[PDB]
Amino acid sequence: TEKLEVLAKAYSVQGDKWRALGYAKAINALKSFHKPVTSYQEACSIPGIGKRMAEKIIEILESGHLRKLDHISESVPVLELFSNIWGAGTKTAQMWYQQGFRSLEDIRSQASLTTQQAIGLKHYSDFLERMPREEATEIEQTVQKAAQAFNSGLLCVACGSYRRGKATCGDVDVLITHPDGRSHRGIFSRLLDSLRQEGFLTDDLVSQEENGQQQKYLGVCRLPGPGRRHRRLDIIVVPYSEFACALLYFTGSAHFNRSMRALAKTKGMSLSEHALSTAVVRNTHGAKVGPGRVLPTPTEKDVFRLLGLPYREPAERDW
């Protein structure tokens, strides 16, 4: 478990996403075994664990150490360091490494940075910190108030880890919509200008403001007063007809979403933040070829029901 995690992270930072999820699944299994793995045959009996993983287990439980962990490239720690810069992923980290960069100082002084990456670097430490749930509330209220200021009808909901009831939040995810099914259009320009006027927003990461069909705003904010840190803010404005699917998507968790969408896929359906669809056509590779039909989903419960699944409260989706 504690040993299988080091490998999982290494593969993740190296770009082997599926192997990484493979390890993550095994680790999760071991963390829920009525008893500690005492034998190879026992390890193989657990779903999500096979000979390969079992062997490594039978080694850690015996040899006390896993030879694998002692052979992990020395580049990993650096790749992880670089990958934690907002806007930089595995490809950029590997490129910087190949170019001989080994520290953030190297990046600051020698690396070519995108506009997003420079913001990520400037707030490096802050972006790795999680904020108290209470601060998330304060941030949501700052956005809601600015929104209801020019349209008291607007509906604002804090989603993500906040809605799932977590004690701390990585960022604050605010969903904005309007019950009148029309007053949501082009409200990003007004809201962002307002939030900027009060100095709440400090940096923009993703915001297609030239597009009137802008769907999301990814940025950075900071509440007033001393002792405040820069916090990440994710805002999406959606049409009321998509409210249920958008809320479901934005609430997550990410793992929960992928599992739910995977289920829908096994039923010839498809689920996005826009809608739940049926009669979806896919090829042998599993890729979509036909769009299908959009199903009516007034509430999140409707989505679960149409999928033949028992409704799950947000805190029940913390996967």
Next chain:
DNA sequence: CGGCAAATACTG
């Protein structure tokens, strides 16, 4: 062999 814990939104 090859899909799996998906499906979609910006950036340049």
Next chain:
DNA sequence: CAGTAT
């Protein structure tokens, strides 16, 4: 489009 993000 490739890369990164939710």
Next chain:
DNA sequence: GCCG
């Protein structure tokens, strides 16, 4: 990596 797992598994059909």
